[PDB]
Each structure stands twice: as structure tokens, then as C-alpha cells.
Symmetry: D2
Subunit: 221 residues, 4 copies
């Protein structure tokens, strides 16, 4: 392969959210095989961002996933050529985000070029009023469709005062190379904002992913 116990990360994101443009860069590091990582991010244009930073966070790389050896790792196999992805996030109040990202490797550094579009967030809703506290942790199902890997998740944001604001995630990941394809399976995720200034110009972001099958054993044969 070419991936190691420790890898560095470089992110570049541009986007637009409800007519507001912004760019954000980051530099981070993680452990592909243990499926954890941390990223330091800076808002370069558009500060102070007037929407919850949480809608961005999952946009900011499934090579940092712990993949048992019994499950082909689509992502690690995709390198050095790499892989890209595309995502739709539809919120329950009809806010919506579409997102594209290219994932290359130079040396030990993965670079992430991300474009991020968000739209239709009601001016008095949790996103533009920043009432989000965090994403509940989540489980993503991964299936093949046209040889692409496609993943879906029912996500929820924990709001100030408990209870949740939901959004459905659809992601399509595409290798730039012939790779052994996995069976149907899952990824347990927890994403976290560790630390941030009050306005979010700097944010330290963290992510744990573990792949599996189901743990309920089949009655079949």
C-alpha cells in the first residue's frame, strides 16, 4: 500500500451556505489503522460564520477507519491513486447540503479538496441560530451500487435543551482504481469538536470510525 500507523492531513474547503461564502483550511493528523484523527482548522474567509459549524464537520476521510481484516477496505486499497466522494445531506426542516471532496496522497499527507454547498436553512432554525451542541454518534450502512460504495445514515444533532434535529446522509465514494469490493456492512462513527474559540475561527475536530458486520449472528446456513 503506502499508508502507515501515522499520517498527516491537509484540508482545503470552500463553500457557500445560505448566500454566505467562506473558506476554511486545516492541518491535522491521524491513524489510518486505528481509525481516529484530529484536525486543526482555520476560517480563512467568511468569518464569523453565521451558521452552526457542525454542518461542516463530517465534510472535513474514510481511510481513517478501523477495518477488520475480514472486510475489504475500499479506502486504504484505493491509494496511491486515491478516491473521491459526493454527499447529500437533507435535514428534516428541508435545509440541504451537497458536498464533493477529492482525496489524494502526497508523501504521508492526505490532502482534501472540498467544496461545500448548503441551502434552504430557515433563518430561525437550529443551523442559522447556532443551537446545535453536537452530532449524536451514528451508524452508516455501506452497500455496492454500480461498483461504487454508497453509504446512508440517519443523523441527528443534539440541540440546546436536549432532543434532536435530524438529517439523512447519502454518500457515494469512488476509487480511481480497480479494488476488491466489500460486502454489505457498517461504520460506527463518533465525530467531535474538542475545542474551538467562541466564534469558531479555530476549531479542533476529532473522528473515530470502526467497520464491522452486524453482531447478531444469523440463524440461516
Amino acid at each position: 500500500n503506502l499508508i502507515k500507523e501515522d499520517m498527516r492531513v491537509k484540508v482545503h474547503m470552500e463553500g457557500n451556505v445560505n448566500g454566505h461564502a467562506f473558506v476554511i483550511e486545516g492541518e491535522g493528523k491521524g491513524k489510518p489503522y486505528e481509525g481516529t484523527q484530529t484536525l486543526n482548522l482555520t476560517v480563512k474567509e467568511g468569518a464569523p460564520l453565521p451558521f452552526s459549524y457542525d454542518i461542516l464537520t463530517t465534510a472535513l476521510n474514510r481511510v481513517f477507519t478501523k477495518y477488520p481484516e475480514d472486510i475489504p477496505d475500499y479506502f486504504k486499497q484505493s491509494f496511491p491513486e486515491g478516491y473521491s466522494w459526493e454527499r447529500t445531506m437533507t435535514y428534516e426542516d428541508k435545509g440541504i447540503c451537497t458536498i464533493r471532496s477529492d482525496i489524494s496522497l502526497e508523501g504521508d499527507c492526505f490532502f482534501q479538496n472540498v467544496r461545500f454547498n448548503g441551502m434552504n436553512f430557515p433563518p430561525n432554525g437550529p443551523v442559522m441560530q447556532k443551537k446545535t451542541l453536537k452530532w449524536e454518534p451514528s451508524t452508516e450502512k455501506l452497500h455496492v451500487r454500480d461498483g461504487l460504495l454508497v453509504g446512508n445514515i440517519n443523523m441527528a444533532l443534539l440541540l440546546e435543551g436536549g432532543g434532536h434535529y435530524l438529517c439523512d446522509f447519502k454518500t457515494t465514494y469512488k476509487a480511481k482504481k480497480v479494488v476488491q469490493l466489500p460486502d454489505y456492512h457498517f461504520v460506527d462513527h463518533r465525530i467531535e469538536i474538542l475545542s474551538n474559540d467562541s466564534d469558531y475561527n479555530k476549531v479542533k475536530l476529532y473522528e473515530h470510525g470502526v467497520a464491522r458486520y452486524s453482531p447478531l449472528p444469523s440463524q440461516a446456513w
Copy 2:
């Protein structure tokens, strides 16, 4: 009230693509280890022109294994019971709306089911009976209006390896005040164990185990 072993009885009235049917079933389970089995029989509208897989999840979370650190909304619902209302949206516009009332009498739960399936395309894998099974899934649960809401991104393995996808939303409604749990998951696995040629006779199995995320929070301490 809820004993290590219990019986189950089901009555379902349905209509799928303007075709009515009725199904009766009887079985048993271990509410606390969240396993159970069911014998089903078509008492009307035999033989069914469409895949039995759409019916199976309609035919009680009482049978879920809950850790003692998650409140069991369901068990708590009893003696009195709880009802549930569910949407199933298929990727090709096929829709079922489903409702079930769950009362207890003796050692045997009784489930009264209304199941309306509409709008399946004639040449889709539903009417052409081209599905094989549900992949096991992970449902996520939350409180909203004092009821409990489950969402699941479902998928049918087709004949030829592909998947036919379906989203699930169930609102569960205890008929008394109970102790509401924190946001959690239930992992599932449903399987048809045996069937006669017509699926006029069906032997169903379900395993449901509740949990939090396996992944540690890293933020603060």
C-alpha cells in the same frame, strides 16, 4: 408481568397494490434476550402476488435486549401496552403505511396490524418477487413529543447481489407514562427461516439488541 418466556399472536389486515389479504400468526419469544419466532398463515387473499419481505418487519420491540442502563420504553408500556405507526419509503416510490396495536393478555402478546402497501411498480423487484432478504440493520431512537421515534436505512439483497433500499420511520406510543431513554440504537436481524411455495405458510425470526455507541467520547472529561 413480563416473563422470561412469552407467547405472541398476530393479526394483520393488508392491501398491497389493490390486492387485499389477511394473515394470522402465533409464536413465542424471550423478551429479555430480544429473540423470537413466528408462524404465519395467509387466511385470505392467498396466494400473494408480491415479495413477502415487505411484510416481515410489520409482524414488537418488547422483544429487544436492553441493557439495564437503557430505559426499556416498551416493557414499561405494560400492563397497558403501546401502539406504533410506521412509514416505509422504497427507493422506487413504493410506499407502505403501517400501524400496530400491542396489548397483553395472559402470557401472550397480541398484535393487531393494519398494513397498506401502495404504488409498487409492476416490474419492480417487489411485484416480480426478486428480493431475497433484509440485510441486518441499526435503528436509532429518540424522544420527540414524549413518544419514541426509530429511523433505519433498510436494504433488500436482490437476486444478483444488488440492493433495493427503503427508509423506515416508526413512532412508538406507550399508552401510559414511562421512563424515557437517552438517544440510542438497536441492532436488528430478521430472517425468514422456512416457507411453503406460496408463502401462504411462513416461519419468521427476529433478534433485536439495544445499545449506545461503542465509541468513547474524547471531548473533555
Copy 3:
């Protein structure tokens, strides 16, 4: 056979959010003009603890005015009749599924309906009864697998400003093969003309005229 003046007979079994109900109605209409009137009484379930507005459209495109040049899928389907099957997906994820069989017994039509509504948030505008009226609407109808699909963007005007949105998708079913209409529209307006604050008793009027577009083509 479908004569200028007809009688309508209406029976509806329903469950919304668990509360079961039966509603019966009878009236008359001018099918070839698009109007009809209906006197409804609630036989079971009263008082209904939810917006009556959800029910009113499930209570016949036979009473649409159709022109010469647009096939009338509905009057054509008689004397044998048709059924239909409808999905209503409301913006707060309240959803309804309806079926109604439309039959003829001489001068009176007998529409027999199954209504099912569920997941209405207990505090939403349907269970709290905060809806004044359906707006007037326009349904696009097209062919897909030999049968006739309608879609309509619906909206209920709400107690003091605000609109609550609903998508309607109906699929219609001929009890004969009929002539298949080209893509086209049917403008709608329905209204409760009177009621008892509980809606035990209601008067109900529908209008509607099938048309093509009122804009001309520049295609050559």
C-alpha cells in the same frame, strides 16, 4: 348514461393516528360542468379529534368538466367504473394512504373509501385543528405503466397566516381499457360550505375543469 344530473353516495371507513371513524354522505352534482355538493354525517368516532380538512379530497374526477379534445378517463370508464389509490405526504411527515372504489348504480354513484392517516405530530396543525381551508389546486396527470397518475402540490391555509403543505400522488385505475389521455391538468377547488363546530355535519362543494395548458407552443 352518466346524465347531466346525478346522485352521489359516499361511505368512508378511516383511522387517523389511532382514532377510528365512519363517515356517510349523499348529494348531487353536474358531472360535465365539474361541480357537486355533499351532505356528510359522522356515524362512528365523533367527535373527530383532527382536521376534517384531511378527509375532504378523499370524499371523484367523474365530476370534472372535460373538453372534447381531452380524453375523459373517468366518464369513459363507466358503466364498469374505476378505483384509485392515493398518497398524501404532509411537510411535518404526517402521511395518509387512501383507496376508493367508484361504482355506478343507475343515477347514483357509490364511492367506497378507506382512509388511513398516521404520524401526525400530536401538536401539529392537523391534530390541533389549525387549518382553515385547502387552497385551490392544479393536478398534472400522465401515463406510466398504462394507468393514470396525478400529482398535486397541495396546501392548507392556516389559522392566522401560514400554509401547511401536502404532496398528492394518486394513481387511477380503469375497469375497462379506455382511450389514454395525453399529459394534461385539472384545476381544482373544494370548500366546506357549512358545519357544526365538531364537524359531525358538513356541506362540501367541489369544482374542477380539465384542460391542457393556456400557453401556446413555439416548437418547430
Copy 4:
């Protein structure tokens, strides 16, 4: 009355659709109060387009709409300043298009810059296989939410062979100064391409758009 019977139009488009970038520019003329315009288009970069061009055409201005007297033009009254809109197009085949447009006025000539993002269109798809003939005439319904003008349409593309590729359109319209909003109403739409060259790099486009309330008069008025 800053706006004339006759106005010119500038139109500038960049976008993606399944991973294929493009930049489209057009010049045209039209009549605001009659509801009619025309438009000539060069595919500036990205030619030949690898997708159907109809998916673009509704993004290449509701000024060019005949608004009767008793419904205030939300769109013409928006100026001098200008306006924007956000739009989703959710195709039945799950291809999604998310669109933001920015509409100005200098001299006699309105400027349109469009951000076209296109996603998830199948490879045996109508939009990728270029199988579309035109949009069927339409009726949009338009309402107030959050003091923004929202519109919903049930659109349908006719396809070689007859038959139809459906798409649900919601567009939310955003004036940059505080106009008086109309009540509930409808626009009838007809959009037509008047001619194209084989790969469609060159195109003239014509839309006609009339506002109205429901013709039907009120029984209870």
C-alpha cells in the same frame, strides 16, 4: 417603473453534473410584462455536454412573467436592488440538482449568474444518456414562508418514446429589499428550446410565464 416593455438579459452559468464542469453564457432579450423571453447560448467550456440540456433550462427569472394587477409582482418590485433564489430538483431517479441564482440590473439588461450543482444521475440515466425531448408545460404554486416567496412544481420531462421523467421543484425566492408579498397564487409555465446544434453547444431558449389565481370562482364568495 424602472423596468421596460423590452429588456436584454445577460446569463452566466458555471456548474457540475455527475463530475463534469461547465461554463455557459448567453445573451437574450425579452419582454417583462408579457411573460416572454428568448436566449442564445454558447457552451463556453465543457463541450460537448455529456448530459441532457433540459436539466439546465429552468435556471437559464420570474420577472419575465405576466403578473396581473391584483397580485404584486414579487420579482419586478425587488429591484433596483435585485434578488436571488435557491432551488432543489429532486428527480424520481434520485439525481439531485441544487441551484442558487443571483439576479441583477444595470441599464436595460438583467444579469444572471447561476451556480449549478448536479449529482447522482445514473449512467444509464435520462440525463446522462441524453434521452430528453422537453419539459411539459407546468403550474407552480407559490406561497409565503418566513417572508420568503416559496414555489412548488410537479414537473415532467418528456422522453423519446413518450413517457416522462418526473422532478419535484421547490424554489424559494429572496428579494434584497423589502417588497410586499403576494397571497397564494400560480404561475403557468411553458419552457421551450427553439433550436440547437448536434452536441447542443449552441441553443436558443424561450419561456412564457403567466401568473394568476385559480380561474374557478368561489362558491362561498
